[PDB]
Design an enzyme around this catalytic site. Structure first.
Site, PDB file in Angstrom:
ATOM      1  N   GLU C 178       0.817  -1.197   0.000  1.00  0.00           N
ATOM      2  CA  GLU C 178       0.000   0.000   0.000  1.00  0.00           C
ATOM      3  C   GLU C 178       0.857   1.254   0.000  1.00  0.00           C
ATOM      4  O   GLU C 178       0.822   2.023  -0.958  1.00  0.00           O
ATOM      5  CB  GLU C 178      -0.996  -0.036   1.169  1.00  0.00           C
ATOM      6  CG  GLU C 178      -0.426  -0.262   2.552  1.00  0.00           C
ATOM      7  CD  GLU C 178      -1.524  -0.396   3.603  1.00  0.00           C
ATOM      8  OE1 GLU C 178      -2.713  -0.309   3.237  1.00  0.00           O
ATOM      9  OE2 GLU C 178      -1.205  -0.597   4.794  1.00  0.00           O
ATOM     10  N   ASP C 179       1.677   1.443   1.011  1.00  0.00           N
ATOM     11  CA  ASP C 179       2.613   2.541   1.011  1.00  0.00           C
ATOM     12  C   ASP C 179       4.039   2.076   1.184  1.00  0.00           C
ATOM     13  O   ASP C 179       4.949   2.890   1.049  1.00  0.00           O
ATOM     14  CB  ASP C 179       2.265   3.541   2.107  1.00  0.00           C
ATOM     15  CG  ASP C 179       1.328   4.603   1.628  1.00  0.00           C
ATOM     16  OD1 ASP C 179       1.466   5.018   0.464  1.00  0.00           O
ATOM     17  OD2 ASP C 179       0.459   5.030   2.412  1.00  0.00           O
TER      18      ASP C 179
END
Ligand SMILES: [Zn+2]
Ligand SMILES: [Zn+2]
Lengths: 66, 254, 432, 37, 48, 38, 51, 330, 115, 40, 44, 25
Positions: C178-179
């Site tokens: 995701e990040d």
């Protein structure tokens, strides 16, 4: 603080090209020509000298402990 | 069912560069050669630092780290040194390591560049690549740096300070005759330097019966190991990994 | 008419009728600002710049630029009375670091403004004498390759907080979910984003009551012992540890005994294995003995450490692949950071991709690019037409090869140099 | 005379001259000087 | 309370941004207005 | 303790969490021990 | 307040700011109170004297 | 958990063009945990043995599930005309007998929903079987994406000159339409619609014109996204971002609202000191007519900061109220 | 702390065998070789050489987890050929190719240096 | 008409606040009043 | 025990039960003269 | 009752596993 040896990405030694880069910039070479004269072709290596801030030159202003 | 017979054509050989071409080999063999160039050619690099005096503005681990990244000319000694875990000496010996010292002190009034020409070695053949110098630290009047160091043998799979290459260009099928990359617009794309296309054509016509052959390399050197020696040591080290695997396997089948 | 104290104001160029009063001679005299004594105040006092405050600002008719606003056209306003110097002077100190902030969505400018205050760097030049608790100093900070003009005045070329990574926006092995980001392990071995972490411990030798005096002394097995704990052998005989010794978890720093003597020795803050950097001994205001001890711990980026761009989204490091496992280019340029593609769209940070494109042009051209917000002399088309002059794809894409199998990747990966910050968080601060 | 296309460098000489004189904590310092004086 | 904070020394930008910080109170006047919003009048004078 | 280390049925040995233990962070997971610090 | 008119570091050049072990880039504008560096956050309030 | 990472990728994997070779297929079958050791027959035997994305996916799909979803971009005029069981765009999904026969997957087919092949798997096959189905999708897709790669760059955010002219003309029409509405109001030809005001009549009319402009730009942009575009890849599988995000990246950021209305008159009768008093045009009250690729002018930047702080405050107040309601219920 | 020493990606500890063979039971003539302290360098060449044998119906490798240093190579041959021999022959033909490549590179060098 | 929805309405339902912020009332007409607008 | 004056850099032997005070400088801040116990770094 | 460590992703675990450092364990 001080110029890294070894471009981070590729590993080519840029740590002996800092005084040469400064000497070629004070002899009026644009930075793109000073970096081509030191033989730094890949932009990964050219950002190591292009974007370096020499802070050890400012830390050598404070007198040592002894 | 059997081995292919590759062929090498060397396009350029300088003191810092080999440009060659391998033909008639699998893409997986050529990529494992590239991978071994980077990560399994032994080299000598400082791996044990002990600082007896450091008045500099960089802490001790800063300096040890910089000293680890100075390339030492390990041209013909790495095949003779032992890995420190193979050798019998207690900690270090002239069989598994090379001893360096540094002893610099700024007495003048100008800043003193402690460079790699101040690393003096006990064995005259493995030295920093000074045969400009790599700036270890800058000193000020009254500051000192006095250290001992030991260079051992290893490869870039352990630490990147034992990686001898400084950039391996590898490329197969320059003009995209195999469509391993699909260009949304093929004409926006700069032609590779190995293309055999004219200036109007932008991409070779699809080759349905083709596989990647003719891999183009460009192995640069960090000064430590003489690039054609990098390539020869990579081939020998890959073949030795395979033959040791073959011994373990031949022992496991029975 | 106000002469109060506390009225916030700002300088503005005066436009008499429809022409700036700032003529070319004021600029010629300010170029020679040294050896001329022509400063800001000689420009205020010349009646060519004014200070307008927030309620005088409602009677004025501002222009944004002279070059456009006071030029004759189909008339909008022709009674302009002031002019903006530069419209990007509406931004604060931490938002003057963001490059191309007129291409991000404002939640991203706000997030980054908050994360430019967490990036390590060099925080002040004399950190060598300052025994703060908790200092974080990057080894090799770099000034940005794509930089705002408002950063020349924030001294961000001189105490910069971050490093220009080579960033590929690519799905590589799923460890950038995701990040998260994938870091080069070889770059990290070569000094990339390494950090130093200093902590100071103070203690004073207070003799407050008549008896029960605290005193610095090596406790261990000396004389009149009390509740001596684990380990007391690195102390010197004055009860203070010496600079250059390696202290581990639950190890004694200051040997204080509060006298039949109890011990109130100082241990390290629950583990970190640093090295004692500096031990200063002095006297406080009361004339009692006083000691500050700074220990140093090097911090190499890890699987937990958080890094963030100047375009406001931060991510841990999912995994670190060595240089031979990274996707390479036909030149051997393995990315330093691989970030997830599915992060970019949802955040409006086209400024991140324009920063990579302008940064590629700047690293190849040998310049340092201008990311000032409201430029209009810097498009994406003008950056692309310069990137296609150094022999790259004009939009910054690049045929990457797979580092595991060596095979090209069917879609061309967007790669280029982006300034990354190492956020102060990390993970060494949680496992101790 | 007027600055027509030299603006974007005029723009930033005027701002450099601002920050050369004032700085960035000028409000703190000017306020304390007023207090103490 | 909340005046006189310890100076933030994590970065140079953190420091410079601490020495140029305002503070809208949330006392009785924060009970009557919309003090958390960006007003038109903050233009050029507070960072949006 | 060279003397105490003998075990016979009914003792509770308080071992270290290993692969396959079941933990909860309200759902539960099976531990797998991995070599880094997160 | 540091680097204000009544500080000992008021006009000092960058050399003599380094002979005192002070950073020439430090902006000043804080108080050194019991060792700690304190910042007086600027408290905003309603204007007086106006209807 | 099936995150955007393996949802865009599964929409690209199951497209009709994904022909895997023998070594790639064997590589992928190494990551199927539920594989029976049998290599399926290629879709294409001659001239080259060449599997398909739907074959390896039908190897992932558990048991003998049956399902008929309908991919996101399905033309609705297709089910009626011919090509109803042929579907030239490959937009109708038919997992028949545990085996993807046609149709591109997405989150509409792989999320959890009504239908939603993973749901039918949980209902029909079991509960650990769907755990394995999730993890298998993820692993074989991660590795095929090693072969295929996904990126996002400039040029995904750039539209051909035809679409730029389309969006510029849409915006110019909206400008001149709000201009003629304003001239009506200024000459009193505007008659208040029954119920609210004349000011609210004008306000609703203008907000209507401007929101229609923003939506027309967003659609006219997304209709020009090539198949080689990765923002289309993001959105059509619903994996990451909304199509309004890509609209703003490509087309127009649109009208900024503070508390539901256009930007308030915060100075005396103007929104900023740059506008003339009593300006109701779209530029004055907050209409950002640039995309994030062209960049916002200084006033659009400020109105956008104004209108995007409302989001930051709404976020906090909603999280607070929601936690309260949840605890009270529980 | 929990930092694995850098040398344990290539250094066997006591009792690791460097290779184990498990017959795969789902299909006939399939083996599963788990090789410790190896990576894609040695896995990918062996796979691509096995895929050259006409009596190999499946060759594949996988690194189970990137933080553990081992590969699994699954082989499946035709009934008149065992996967142990297919593996052995792959390694022998790789060794032969790299021997050829080494001597060809020595000759190419010694000609480039105009020896 | 302007009705409260979302979380404020949800919590004025979870509570039985005898003073909803917008206590509306939907009225349906039965006779000819339903089709013909004037009697409505 | 040798300490070092933080102003004049002269080392002076301040044994305990004696106020910290640099001889011939009267400075009241002293640093503690780095140890001789040898510590080893791997150059990584 | 752990040292509240960070959570990073790991696509090589089963969705019913957690990867625990040897120091938390
Ligand atoms: Zn490089
Ligand atoms: Zn003295």
């Amino acid at each position: 603080m001080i110029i890294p040896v070894r471009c981070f990405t590729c590993g080519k030694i840029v740590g002996n090209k800092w005084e040469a880069y400064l000497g070629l910039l004070q002899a009026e070479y644009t930075e793109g020509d000073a970096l081509d004269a030191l033989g730094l072709k890949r932009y990964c290596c050219r950002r190591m000298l292009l974007a370096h801030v020499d802070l050890i030159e400012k830390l050598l202003n404070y007198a040592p402990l002894e | 069912p059997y081995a292919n017979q590759p062929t090498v054509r060397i396009t350029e050989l300088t003191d810092e560069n080999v440009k060659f071409i391998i033909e008639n080999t699998d893409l997986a063999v050529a990529n494992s050669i590239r991978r071994v160039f980077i990560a399994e050619v032994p080299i000598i690099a400082i791996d044990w630092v002990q600082i007896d005096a450091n008045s500099s503005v960089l802490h001790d681990e800063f300096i040890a780290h910089r000293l680890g990244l100075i390339p030492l000319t390990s041209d013909d000694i790495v095949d003779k040194l032992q890995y420190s875990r193979d050798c019998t000496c207690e900690e270090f010996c002239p069989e598994c390591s090379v001893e360096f010292t540094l002893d610099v002190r700024c007495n003048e009034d100008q800043t003193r560049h402690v460079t790699s020409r101040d690393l003096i070695s006990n064995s005259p053949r493995v030295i920093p690549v000074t045969s400009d110098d790599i700036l270890i630290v800058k000193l000020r009047k009254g500051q000192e740096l006095r250290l001992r160091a030991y260079a051992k043998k290893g490869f870039g799979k352990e630490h990147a300070k034992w990686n001898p290459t400084a950039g391996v260009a590898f490329e197969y099928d320059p003009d995209n005759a195999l469509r391993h990359t699909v260009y949304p617009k093929p004409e926006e794309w700069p032609k590779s330097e190995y293309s055999e296309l004219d200036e109007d054509e932008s991409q070779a016509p699809y080759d349905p019966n083709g596989k990647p052959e003719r891999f183009y390399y460009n192995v640069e050197s960090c000064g430590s190991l003489r690039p054609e020696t990098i390539v020869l040591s990579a081939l020998s080290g890959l073949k030795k990994k395979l033959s040791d695997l073959q011994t373990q396997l031949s022992h496991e089948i029975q | 008419i106000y002469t109060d104290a506390g009225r916030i104001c700002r300088p503005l160029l005066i436009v008499e009728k429809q022409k700036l009063l700032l003529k070319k001679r004021h600029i010629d005299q300010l170029k020679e600002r040294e050896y001329n004594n022509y400063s800001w105040q000689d420009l205020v006092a010349s009646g060519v710049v004014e200070y307008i405050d927030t309620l005088e600002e409602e009677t004025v008719m501002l222009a944004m630029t002279p070059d456009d606003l006071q030029e004759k056209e189909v008339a909008y306003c022709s009674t302009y009375t002031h002019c903006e110097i530069h419209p990007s002077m509406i931004l604060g100190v931490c938002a003057s670091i963001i490059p191309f902030p007129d291409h991000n969505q404002s939640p991203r400018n706000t997030y980054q403004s908050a994360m430019g205050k967490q990036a390590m760097g060099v925080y002040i030049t004399n950190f060598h004498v300052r025994m703060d608790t908790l200092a974080h100093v990057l080894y090799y900070p770099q000034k940005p390759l794509v930089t705002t003009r408002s950063m020349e005045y924030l001294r961000f070329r001189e105490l910069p907080a971050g490093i220009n990574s080579i960033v590929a926006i690519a799905s590589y092995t799923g460890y950038n979910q995701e990040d998260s980001v994938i870091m080069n392990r070889s770059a990290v071995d070569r000094g990339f984003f390494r950090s130093v972490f200093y902590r100071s411990y103070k203690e004073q030798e207070s003799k407050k009551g008549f008896d029960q005096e605290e005193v610095f002394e090596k406790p261990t097995r000396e004389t009149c012992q009390g509740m001596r704990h684990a380990i007391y052998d690195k102390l010197d005989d004055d009860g203070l540890i010496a600079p250059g010794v390696r202290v581990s978890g639950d190890d004694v720093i200051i040997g204080k005994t509060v006298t039949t003597k109890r011990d109130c020795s100082t241990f390290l803050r629950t583990s970190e294995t640093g090295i004692v950097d500096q031990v200063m001994v002095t006297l406080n205001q009361e004339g009692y003995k006083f000691c500050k001890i700074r220990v140093r711990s090097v911090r190499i980026p890890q699987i937990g450490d958080k890094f963030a761009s100047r375009h406001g989204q931060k991510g841990t490091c999912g995994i670190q692949y060595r240089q031979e496992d990274m996707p390479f280019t036909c030149e051997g340029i393995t990315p330093d950071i691989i970030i997830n593609p599915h992060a970019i769209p949802s955040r409006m940070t086209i400024g991140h991709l324009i920063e990579c494109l302008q940064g590629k042009v700047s690293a190849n051209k040998g310049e340092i690019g201008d990311a000032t917000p409201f430029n209009d002399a810097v498009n994406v088309q003008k950056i692309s037409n310069l990137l296609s002059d150094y022999g790259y794809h004009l939009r910054g894409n690049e045929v990457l090869y797979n580092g595991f199998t060596g095979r090209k990747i069917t879609s061309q990966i967007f790669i280029g140099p982006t300034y990354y910050q190492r956020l102060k968080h990390m993970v060494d601060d949680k496992i101790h | 005379e007027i600055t027509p296309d030299l603006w974007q460098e005029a723009c930033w000489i005027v701002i450099s001259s601002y920050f050369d004189e004032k700085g960035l904590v000028r409000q703190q310092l000017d306020s304390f000087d007023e207090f103490i004086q | 309370a909340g005046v006189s904070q310890v100076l933030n020394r994590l970065t140079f930008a953190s420091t410079l941004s601490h020495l140029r910080r305002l503070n809208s109170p949330i006392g009785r006047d924060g009970k009557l207005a919309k003090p958390r919003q960006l007003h038109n009048t903050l233009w050029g004078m507070v960072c949006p | 303790k060279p003397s105490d280390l003998h075990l016979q049925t009914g003792y509770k040995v308080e071992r270290h969490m290993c692969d396959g233990d079941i933990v909860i962070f309200m759902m539960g997971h099976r531990v797998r021990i991995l070599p880094w610090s997160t | 307040m540091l680097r204000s008119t009544y500080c000992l570091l008021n006009g000092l050049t960058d050399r003599d700011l380094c002979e005192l072990n002070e950073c020439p880039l430090d902006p000043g504008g804080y108080f050194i109170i019991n060792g700690s560096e304190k910042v007086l956050i600027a408290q905003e309030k309603m204007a007086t004297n106006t209807v | 958990g099936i995150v955007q990472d393996t949802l865009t990728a599964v929409r690209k994997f199951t497209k009709r063009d994904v022909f895997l070779e023998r070594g790639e297929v064997m590589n992928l079958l190494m990551f199927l945990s539920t594989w029976d050791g049998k290599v399926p027959q290629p879709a294409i035997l001659k001239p080259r043995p060449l599997w398909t994305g739907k074959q390896i996916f039908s190897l992932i799909i558990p048991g003998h599930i049956n399902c008929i979803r309908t991919h996101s971009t399905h033309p609705d005029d297709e089910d009626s005309g011919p090509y109803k069981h042929i579907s030239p765009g490959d937009t109708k999904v038919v997992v028949e007998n545990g085996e993807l026969i046609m149709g591109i997957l997405c989150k509409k087919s792989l999320g959890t929903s009504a239908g939603s092949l993973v749901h039918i798997s949980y209902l029909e096959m079991g509960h650990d079987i769907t755990r394995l189905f999730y993890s298998n999708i993820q692993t074989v897709i991660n590795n095929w994406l090693l072969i295929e790669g996904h990126t996002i760059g400039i040029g995904d955010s750039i539209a051909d000159s035809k679409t730029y002219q389309d969006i510029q003309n849409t915006i110019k029409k909206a400008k001149q339409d709000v201009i003629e509405v304003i001239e009506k109001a200024h000459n009193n030809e505007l008659e208040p619609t029954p119920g609210n005001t004349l000011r609210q009549t004008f306000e609703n009319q203008v907000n209507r014109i401007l929101n229609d402009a923003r939506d027309k730009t967003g659609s006219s942009a997304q209709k020009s996204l090539s198949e080689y575009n990765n923002f289309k890849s993001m959105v059509v599988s619903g994996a990451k971002g909304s199509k309004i995000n890509i609209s703003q990246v490509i087309a127009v950021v649109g009208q900024q609202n503070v508390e539901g209305k256009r930007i308030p008159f915060g100075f005396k009768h103007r929104t900023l000191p740059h506008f003339i008093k009593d300006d109701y045009g779209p530029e004055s009250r907050g209409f950002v007519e640039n995309s994030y690729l062209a960049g916002l002018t200084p006033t659009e930047f400020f109105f956008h900061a104004m209108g995007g702080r409302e989001g930051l405050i709404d976020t906090a107040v909603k999280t607070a109220e929601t936690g309260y309601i949840q605890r009270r219920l529980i | 702390m929990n930092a694995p020493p850098a040398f344990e990606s290539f250094l066997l500890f006591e009792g690791e065998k460097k290779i184990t063979i498990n017959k795969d039971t789902k299909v006939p003539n399939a083996c599963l070789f788990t090789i410790n302290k190896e990576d894609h360098t040695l896995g990918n060449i062996i796979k691509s050489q096995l895929l050259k044998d006409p009596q190999v119906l499946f060759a594949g490798y996988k690194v189970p987890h990137p933080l553990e240093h081992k590969i699994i190579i699954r082989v499946q041959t035709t009934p008149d050929y065992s996967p142990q021999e297919a593996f052995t022959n792959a390694i022998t033909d790789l060794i032969s190719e790299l021997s050829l490549l080494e001597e060809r590179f020595r000759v190419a060098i010694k000609d480039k240096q105009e020896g | 008409k302007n009705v409260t929805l979302g979380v404020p309405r949800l919590k004025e339902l979870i509570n039985i606040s005898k003073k909803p912020k917008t206590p509306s009332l939907t009225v349906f007409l039965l006779g000819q009043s339903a089709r013909d607008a004037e009697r409505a | 025990m040798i300490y070092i004056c933080g102003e004049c850099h002269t080392e002076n032997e301040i044994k305990s039960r004696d106020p910290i005070r640099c001889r011939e400088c009267g400075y009241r801040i002293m640093y503690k003269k780095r140890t001789k116990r040898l510590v080893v770094f791997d150059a990584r | 009752f752990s040292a509240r460590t960070v959570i990073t992703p790991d696509p090589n675990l089963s969705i019913d596993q957690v990867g625990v450092p040897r120091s938390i364990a």
